[PDB]
C-alpha cells in the first residue's frame, strides 16, 4: 500500500570551473560550465531545515511501511547476529607500563568498558581489575556515543584523557578523569578535535588535532593541563586544502611526528619530547615534493626508518636516514620489488615488522636489528611469516603493541569462515602463542563452509580475483542465490577475512563473494594507483561487472538470484554498476553511498572534496570534467529498469553527506521504468558507521540482510528447511 514520497524540485545552477572568491584549484575552466540540479535544496549544512527534515522523515515512513512484512525475518537474523557475538567478552590484552590493558563487553550493555590489571595478575580477574572508562556511563541519556581513544597519562597512568563524539560527525571533545580519585571533577575540556590524544612527555600537557569549518584536520596544538583551551599553543598549521594534518608518537615515546598528507604527497616534521614542555620547534624531514609519499617510524631518536614511493618505488622501498640529516635518503634498507608491496611498518627496539601483500594476500615480514650494535642492516633482508593456508587475512595490530622493548609483536589472523585469532609472535623465529580466539556461538562451525578463490576476466583481459564462501551442504549442481561485495577505492584492499555479516546469507543457501576489483591494492599498489584512479577510475565498475558476469557464466548464480552490495566509495561502485548493468542484479544494498559525484566534487565547501581532487580528479578542470561525468551515479540515472535497492545513510555523516543518497533515491524513483522498490533508511542519530551501541548496530545490519533474503526468496535457514 505505502507510496513513496514525491520530491519537490527547485531550480539551481551548479557551477563547475572558475568561481571568483573560491579555491576551485590552480586551473579551473574559464568560462565555467553549468549544470541544473533541481534537488540541490536537499542539502542543509546545518541539518535543521524544516522542509529537508520533513522530506527525510517521509522517506523513513515509506521505509518502515515497505519493511513491515520482513519484521519477523529481520528479528530472526538479529537473533542470529546476537548468537554470533559474546554478551560477555574481553579483547586481546597487551602490556603497557605496570599493567595489562583490555576492553570488556558485558551482557546487556551496549558499549565497551576499558579495564586493566597489574602485569602480575590475570586479565578479567574481578579482584584485580580496575575500570578506567565505562563507555556505558559516558553514554547515559545519549542516543549515540562514540568514545574513540582512552589514553592514560605517563608516567603514572593515573590521569586519563578520553575523546567522545555524541552526534557522529567525528568532531570530538577530550575529557579527563583521575583513576585514583574517581569523584574528582577535572575541569579541562578540549573541543573541536579529531578524537586523537597524544600525551606529552608527562602528565602536564597533551597534543591534539583540530578541524577547519570543512572538517579538514589542519592544526596540531598543545594543551597544558589546568589552562583554558583558548591558551593552547598551535604547533603546526596546514593551510593547503589538499592536505590534512596528522600527528603520532614514536614507539620509544621520545619524539612526536607531525605532518601533512594528501593522496599524492606527504611531509613529516619531528618534535623532540626530551626537551621539556615548552619545546615547540619542529625539524623538517624532507620538504613536500608532489607525488612523493613517505612515512617515518623512528628507531630510537638517532635514525628514521622511512617507507616511501620515491624515485619510482611503486610498491615502496625502506630506507634509514640519520636524525641529523633526515633528507639524506641514500641508505636503502629494502629496495622496491615488483612482487612485494610494503604497506606499513612498526619499528621496535631490536626489530621491525612490515605489513603488506604478496601474490594477492596480506603478509607479515620481520627483520632483526644486528645483535652487535642494534642497527638495521640491508644484508639481513625481510623474513616472511610463512602461512599454511591458500586464503586468509593477517593484520599487524599496532594498537596492542605499546612497549618499545617488548620481544613479540601482535598479529591477528582470520579467513572468510575462520574466526579471528590474535597471537604474540617472535620476530626472531616466528614462534607464536595465541592470546585470544574469537568465539562464535549459535551453532557456528568453520568446517560448515567451503572457501575458494576464482578469477573473472575484465575487458582488457586482466584476471580479477574473487574470494567465495558458501555452505558445504549447498547444492552446487545448479545456480544458487549469491551476494557479491565490492569497495574499490583509495588502495584499500578487500580481504577474505572473517565477518558474522555474511553468515545469515551462507546459512540460507547463498554464495557470498568478494570482487577484488582495481582501486583496492590486492595485487600490489599499481592495482590502485594505475588500475583505478583519476582517468582509469572506470576500471573499478567494469571489473565488478566482469566479476558478476563470471558468476553467471560459470552457472554459479543467475541475474534473478544475484544481489550486490557496497558502502561509501563502495556505494559509488553500487551507483555506477546500477546505471551500467542493473540487468545483472535482483536486489542491491548501497550503504552511506558516494553518488553525487559532480556536484559534490566541484564544491570545496563539502567535507573531503578538496583532498579527493587527488583520488578521482577535480571536475572544475577540463582534464576531469567529461570523465567524472561519464560514471557519476546521480548524473547517469536514466529511464530503464533498476533492481530493488535499499540505501542506508546517517544524518550526521561527515564523509558522505546525507543529501547525496536522498537526491539519488529521488531521481531513481522519478526516472526508473520498473515497479521494484527503493528504500531509504536515514538514521537521524548517527554518522557514517551506524550506531556504536552494539545491539542497535546488529538490528540495523539485520534489516539489510532481511531485505536481500526476501528479494532473493532465500529466507529459510538450511538447517531448519
Amino acid at each position: 500500500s505505502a507510496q513513496p514520497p514525491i520530491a519537490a524540485k527547485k531550480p539551481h545552477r551548479v557551477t563547475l570551473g572558475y568561481v571568483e572568491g573560491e579555491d576551485r584549484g590552480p586551473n579551473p575552466m574559464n568560462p565555467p560550465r553549468y549544470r541544473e540540479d533541481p534537488y540541490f535544496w536537499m542539502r542543509d549544512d546545518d541539518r535543521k531545515d524544516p522542509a529537508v527534515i520533513e522530506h527525510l522523515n517521509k522517506e523513513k515512513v515509506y521505509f518502515q511501511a515497505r519493511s513491515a512484512d520482513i519484521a519477523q525475518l529481520r528479528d530472526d537474523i538479529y537473533a542470529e547476529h546476537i548468537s554470533h557475538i559474546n554478551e560477555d567478552d574481553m579483547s586481546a590484552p597487551y602490556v603497557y607500563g605496570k599493567y595489562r590493558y583490555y576492553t570488556r563487553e558485558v551482557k546487556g550493555k551496549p558499549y565497551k568498558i576499558y579495564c586493566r590489571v597489574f602485569t602480575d595478575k590475570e586479565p578479567g580477574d574481578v579482584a584485580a581489575e580496575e575500570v578506567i572508562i565505562d563507555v556505558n556511563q559516558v553514554a547515559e541519556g545519549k542516543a549515540f556515543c562514540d568514545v574513540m581513544e582512552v589514553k592514560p597519562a605517563p608516567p603514572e597512568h593515573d590521569l586519563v584523557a578520553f575523546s567522545v563524539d555524541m552526534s557522529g560527525n567525528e568532531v570530538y571533545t577530550i575529557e579527563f578523569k583521575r583513576i585514583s580519585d574517581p569523584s574528582q571533577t577535572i575541569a579541562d575540556k578540549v573541543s573541536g578535535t579529531n578524537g586523537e590524544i597524544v600525551w606529552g612527555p608527562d602528565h602536564t600537557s597533551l597534543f591534539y588535532v583540530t578541524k577547519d569549518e570543512t572538517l579538514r584536520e589542519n592544526k596540531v596544538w598543545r594543551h597544558v593541563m589546568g589552562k583554558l583551551q583558548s591558551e593552547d599553543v598551535c604547533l603546526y598549521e596546514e593551510h593547503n586544502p589538499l592536505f590534512s594534518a596528522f600527528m603520532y608518537k614514536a614507539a620509544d615515546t621520545n619524539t612526536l611526528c607531525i605532518g601533512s598528507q594528501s593522496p599524492e604527497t606527504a611531509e613529516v616534521h619531528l618534535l623532540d619530547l626530551r626537551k621539556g614542555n615548552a619545546h615547540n620547534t619542529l625539524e623538517i624531514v624532507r620538504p613536500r615534493e608532489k607525488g612523493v609519499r613517505y612515512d617515518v617510524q623512528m628507531h630510537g631518536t638517532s635514525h628514521l626508518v622511512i617507507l616511501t614511493n620515491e624515485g619510482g618505488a611503486v610498491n615502496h622501498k625502506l630506507l634509514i636516514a640519520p636524525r641529523g640529516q633526515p633528507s639524506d635518503w641514500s641508505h636503502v634498507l629494502v629496495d622496491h620489488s615488483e612482487d612485494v608491496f610494503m604497506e606499513s611498518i612498526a619499528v621496535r627496539s631490536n626489530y621491525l615488522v612490515v605489513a603488506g601483500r604478496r601474490a594477492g594476500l596480506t603478509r607479515i615480514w620481520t627483520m632483526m636489528a644486528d645483535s652487535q650494535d642494534g642497527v638495521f642492516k640491508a644484508g639481513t633482508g625481510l623474513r616472511e611469516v610463512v602461512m599454511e593456508e591458500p586464503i586468509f587475512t593477517v593484520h599487524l595490530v599496532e594498537s596492542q603493541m605499546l612497549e618499545y622493548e617488548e620481544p613479540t609483536f601482535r598479529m591477528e589472523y582470520s579467513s572468510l569462515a575462520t574466526p579471528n585469532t590474535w597471537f604474540d609472535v617472535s620476530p626472531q623465529d616466528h614462534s607464536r602463542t595465541a592470546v585470544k580466539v574469537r568465539e562464535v556461538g549459535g551453532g557456528f562451525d568453520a568446517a560448515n563452509y567451503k572457501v575458494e578463490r576464482r578469477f573473472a576476466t575484465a575487458p582488457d583481459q586482466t584476471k580479477i580475483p574473487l574470494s567465495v564462501v558458501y555452505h558445504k551442504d549447498l547444492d552446487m549442481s545448479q545456480p544458487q542465490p549469491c551476494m557479491l561485495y565490492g569497495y574499490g577505492s583509495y588502495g584499500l584492499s578487500m580481504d577474505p577475512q572473517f565477518s558474522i555479516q555474511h553468515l545469515p546469507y551462507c546459512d540460507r543457501g547463498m554464495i557470498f563473494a568478494i570482487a577484488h576489483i582495481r582501486g583496492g591494492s590486492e595485487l600490489g599498489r599499481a592495482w590502485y594507483e594505475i588500475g583505478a584512479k583519476y582517468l582509469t577510475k572506470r576500471n573499478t565498475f567494469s571489473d565488478f561487472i566482469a566479476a558478476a558476469e563470471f558468476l553467471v557464466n560459470a552457472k554459479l548464480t543467475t541475474p534473478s538470484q544475484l544481489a550486490c552490495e557496497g558502502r561509501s566509495a563502495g556505494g559509488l561502485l553500487m551507483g555506477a554498476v546500477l546505471n551500467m548493468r542493473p540487468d545483472l542484479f535482483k536486489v542491491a544494498l548501497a550503504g552511506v553511498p558516494f553518488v553525487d559525484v559532480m556536484t559534490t566534487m566541484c564544491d570545496p565547501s563539502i567535507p573531503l572534496t578538496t583532498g579527493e581532487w587527488e583520488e578521482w580528479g577535480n571536475p572544475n578542470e577540463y582534464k576531469y570534467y567529461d570523465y567524472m561525468l561519464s560514471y557519476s551515479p546521480m548524473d547517469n540515472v536514466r529511464a530503464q529498469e533498476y533492481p530493488n535497492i535499499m540505501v542506508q545513510c546517517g544524518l550526521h555523516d561527515p564523509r558522505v553527506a546525507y543529501w547525496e543518497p536522498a537526491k539519488w533515491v529521488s531521481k531513481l524513483r522519478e526516472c526508473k521504468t520498473d515497479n521494484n522498490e527503493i528504500l531509504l533508511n536515514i538514521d537521524m542519530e548517527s554518522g557514517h558507521f551506524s550506531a556504536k551501541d552494539r545491539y542497535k548496530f546488529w538490528k540495523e545490519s539485520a534489516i539489510q540482510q532481511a531485505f536481500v533474503c526476501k528479494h532473493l526468496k532465500s529466507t529459510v535457514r538450511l538447517l531448519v528447511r
Partner: peptide
Amino acid sequence: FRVR
C-alpha cells in the same frame, strides 16, 4: 583511514 579520511575515506568515504
